[PDB]
């Protein structure tokens, strides 16, 4: 899966 990061990455 994919998580929207606080820094704008998708992890």
């Amino acid at each position, epitope marked *: 899966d994919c998580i929207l990061e*606080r*820094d704008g*990455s998708r992890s």
Partner: antibody
Amino acid sequence: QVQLQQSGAELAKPGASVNLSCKASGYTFTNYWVHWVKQRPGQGLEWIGYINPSNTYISYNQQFKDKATLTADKSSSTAYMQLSRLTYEDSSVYYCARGGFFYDYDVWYFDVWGTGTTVTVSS
Amino acid sequence: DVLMTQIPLSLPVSLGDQASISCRSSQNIVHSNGNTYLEWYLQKPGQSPKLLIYKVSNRFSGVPDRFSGSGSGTDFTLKISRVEAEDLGVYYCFQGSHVPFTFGSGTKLEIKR
């Protein structure tokens, strides 16, 4: 019972490294970011970086990129920060803090703080 | 980096008066998801910081009505109405919108009596 437990103090020698632990309890460790913050005595707060404990994604302040190394152990619900090549300027209080449930963007903030570890660099 | 400039550095206030603290960002702090992550924290002596206000103007759970946050663009303000002895400590603004996240230099609130 949400808390982040840090050891009160670490004494480590100049030119060495030290590993700071931040033990999460009372919530799902893998659903929230853990951040680290430096506070020099008498002085302000400096953000070091954060880790996503579910997938180990790390975001660093470039100022600490060769000073701090963040890791997270899912089985023990513990986040770690290694400080390497210690100098007297690394002596400080370091906090870990819970800084956002991933899936609710309105609550990305530091709601739970660890009690802080006083790092003293000395021989 | 976003510089967060806090004014003043220390502020004496009489009990019952309003205190006002300013925080200016060197650039806009609207995150790419649309939120402005501007928080105010209070750190009392010997303690960790604690959240007072988030997303510029939202009071965190348990924080009294007399704390209010406002602002937009690059100018943000914390107002403390009817200051009480328990309000003592160092207030920090924080932006959580652009890495590296950054704190203001802090405003030490001091009480006259």
